[PDB]
Ligand SMILES: [Cl-]
């Protein structure tokens with residue numbers, strides 16, 4: 001029952017990926033397309049990419065989400081849902097994207 | 103259907119409070135999720151009929167919230183419940199966030 | 209083809225106000241939701257420009273659990289009427305203290 | 317296999333942006349006519365290539381935001397772009413709310 005969660009918080013950009021069936025080959029493709037590597041950590045198993053020097057405005061956030069969706073679509077992961085919040089105290093926004101296999 | 107069968111899972115943090123609503127939700131599916139999420143139980147309340155679990159002691163950071171959502175979605179997928187939509191808000195006054203997950207049969 | 213129209217249902221709390229937009233929404237569907245949502249009964253009223261139906265639940269406050277129940281009953285009721293849930297989003301307004309959720313539906 | 321599309325709407329005042337590598341100008345012009353009608357031009361900018369409309373100097377209330385979303389979704393569906401997901405946030409300091417709609421062929 002393979003699902004994937006991608007979470008993106010801004011700014012600066014921090015992208016997390018969770019899903020037991022996620023391949024390192026897929027992580028590498030997103031590394032290359034999100035225009036600086038994803039580092040793996042266990043418990044829970046996940047990939048993290050932080051771009052500490054970068055600032056993404058609203059349009060660039062839209063662009064990051066498209067590259068993630070498109071990259072994952074080519075690798076057999078289908079977008080099923082998204083949600084987002086903003087934290088007034090930190091000034092950060094966090095978006096989650098949820099994917100499933102076909 | 104009576105009301106064609108859908109499910110709503112809502113999760114508020116922190117501390118974690120998980121609620122599960124849906125006419126066709128069986129107690130056996132609630133018991134499977136009880137095991138995956140973590141020895142805390144869902145309690146049943148009526149009107150609206152639903153199951154509530156509170157992890158009074160626990161604190162979930164963003165990564166662990168993502169993990170909770172993923173475990174809920176994967177456990178429900180195996181039970182025949184497909185994720186259709188999600189939404190979320192944060193309350194600045196309380197510092198709590200609430201995410202809702204909507205599921206339908208396959 | 210064009211294809212079929214879409215539906216947007218929005219709900220703001222509190223107090224609970226439900227609005228429904230969509231050219232192809234039939235009165236029979238509104239009437240079914242009138243009966244399902246509260247569970248003198250409250251009604252949807254029609255207003256033009258933009259054309260929509262509006263219901264307020266009678267001065268209530270709906271806790272987070274009751275908000276989940278309203279959304280489920282809307283989705284379930286519309287699914288039986290041939291409207292399929294495609295997307296949802298929500299925001300909270302810190303200054304009014306109100307939260308708004310949108311549900312978007314397409315024909316099957 | 318195909319590029320996806322993101323339409324973002326921020327209020328107020330209402331500003332609509334469209335981002336998608338495969339978006340045709342006829343689609344943009346169709347929305348250009350449908351949006352003010354449901355409630356002036358989309359202008360092209362680079363880096364990344366996108367389309368931007370300042371729909372009005374007048375403020376949209378919640379009902380008119382609903383109506384903008386619906387007219388966008390309906391117009392894009394007729395052009396072969398299917399709604400897959402949405403998300404939204406509100407910024408308390410700026411007082412602006414931003415909604416993103418994601419579409420696929
Ligand atoms: Cl959302």
Ligand SMILES: [K+]
Pocket residue numbers: 080081186187294295400401
């Ligand atoms: K969806």
Ligand SMILES: [Mg+2]
Pocket residue numbers: 081082083187188189295296297401402403
């Ligand atoms: Mg959503």
Ligand SMILES: [Mg+2]
Pocket residue numbers: 083084085189190191297298299403404405
């Ligand atoms: Mg939100």
